[PDB]
Enzyme design. Structure first.
Site, PDB file in Angstrom:
ATOM      1  N   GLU A  35       0.798  -1.213   0.000  1.00 59.97           N
ATOM      2  CA  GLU A  35       0.000   0.000   0.000  1.00 59.97           C
ATOM      3  C   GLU A  35       0.842   1.280   0.000  1.00 59.97           C
ATOM      4  O   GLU A  35       0.608   2.177  -0.802  1.00 59.97           O
ATOM      5  CB  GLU A  35      -0.963   0.037   1.198  1.00 59.97           C
ATOM      6  CG  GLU A  35      -2.084  -1.018   1.189  1.00 59.97           C
ATOM      7  CD  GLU A  35      -3.123  -0.842   0.094  1.00 59.97           C
ATOM      8  OE1 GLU A  35      -3.185   0.226  -0.542  1.00 59.97           O
ATOM      9  OE2 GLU A  35      -3.912  -1.781  -0.122  1.00 59.97           O
ATOM     10  N   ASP A  49     -13.416   8.964  -7.915  1.00 58.50           N
ATOM     11  CA  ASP A  49     -14.522   9.079  -6.980  1.00 58.50           C
ATOM     12  C   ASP A  49     -14.354  10.189  -5.947  1.00 58.50           C
ATOM     13  O   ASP A  49     -15.129  10.279  -5.005  1.00 58.50           O
ATOM     14  CB  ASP A  49     -14.811   7.721  -6.315  1.00 58.50           C
ATOM     15  CG  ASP A  49     -13.849   7.378  -5.182  1.00 58.50           C
ATOM     16  OD1 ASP A  49     -12.745   7.942  -5.108  1.00 58.50           O
ATOM     17  OD2 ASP A  49     -14.221   6.537  -4.343  1.00 58.50           O
ATOM     18  N   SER A  51     -12.088  10.606  -3.571  1.00 54.64           N
ATOM     19  CA  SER A  51     -11.636  10.183  -2.252  1.00 54.64           C
ATOM     20  C   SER A  51     -10.102  10.121  -2.250  1.00 54.64           C
ATOM     21  O   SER A  51      -9.484  10.087  -3.307  1.00 54.64           O
ATOM     22  CB  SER A  51     -12.223   8.805  -1.906  1.00 54.64           C
ATOM     23  OG  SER A  51     -11.634   7.752  -2.665  1.00 54.64           O
ATOM     24  N   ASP A  53      -6.642   8.188  -0.188  1.00 58.42           N
ATOM     25  CA  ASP A  53      -6.143   7.128   0.675  1.00 58.42           C
ATOM     26  C   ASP A  53      -5.011   7.758   1.476  1.00 58.42           C
ATOM     27  O   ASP A  53      -4.169   8.466   0.913  1.00 58.42           O
ATOM     28  CB  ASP A  53      -5.625   5.963  -0.147  1.00 58.42           C
ATOM     29  CG  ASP A  53      -6.705   5.336  -0.995  1.00 58.42           C
ATOM     30  OD1 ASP A  53      -7.820   5.132  -0.485  1.00 58.42           O
ATOM     31  OD2 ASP A  53      -6.441   5.058  -2.178  1.00 58.42           O
ATOM     32  N   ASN A  60      -9.001   4.754   3.202  1.00 59.60           N
ATOM     33  CA  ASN A  60      -9.858   5.631   2.410  1.00 59.60           C
ATOM     34  C   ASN A  60     -10.792   6.616   3.157  1.00 59.60           C
ATOM     35  O   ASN A  60     -11.550   6.223   4.063  1.00 59.60           O
ATOM     36  CB  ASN A  60     -10.640   4.760   1.426  1.00 59.60           C
ATOM     37  CG  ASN A  60     -11.291   5.557   0.327  1.00 59.60           C
ATOM     38  OD1 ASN A  60     -12.463   5.902   0.420  1.00 59.60           O
ATOM     39  ND2 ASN A  60     -10.553   5.811  -0.741  1.00 59.60           N
TER      40      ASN A  60
END
Length: 130
Positions: A35, A49, A51, A53, A60
């Site tokens: 990640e 979208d 958003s 992370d 998120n």
């Protein structure tokens, strides 16, 4: 902060991640590795979208933390997304624990399925003394 592999391994264990909700420490290590590369200041904007992370586990903003600019979002961890960018990972860990208390568990992160599921993840904790 960019953690060294074993340094993080030892930290996660102390924060009680080993076997949390059935998830081995090696799985958490594999997740953080893919990640963020063990980087606590990592941020990623999802233009698709709206958003973002945040942090070491790339949590998120739509469901877990509040950043104020993500439409129709909730803050299940009851944290500002800013808390997930600190060098001390206590808050990020408390929030990751919240994420996996949901039915999907560790599967909530698609990257885990691609890079960690059904693989020999021993390599992430080998030689760390955990």
């Amino acid at each position: 902060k960019v953690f060294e592999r074993c340094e993080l391994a030892r930290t996660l264990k102390r924060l009680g991640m080993d076997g949390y909700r059935g998830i081995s420490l090696a799985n958490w290590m594999c997740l953080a590795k893919w990640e963020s590369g063990y980087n606590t200041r990592a941020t990623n904007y999802n233009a698709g979208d709206r958003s973002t992370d945040y942090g070491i586990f790339q949590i998120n903003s739509r469901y877990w933390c509040n950043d104020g600019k993500t439409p129709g979002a909730v803050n299940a961890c009851h944290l500002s997304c800013s808390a997930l960018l600190q060098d001390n990972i206590a808050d990020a860990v408390a929030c990751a624990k919240r994420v996996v208390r949901d039915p999907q568990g560790i599967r909530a992160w698609v990257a885990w399925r691609n890079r960690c599921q059904n693989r020999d993840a021993r390599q992430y904790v080998q030689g760390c003394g955990v």
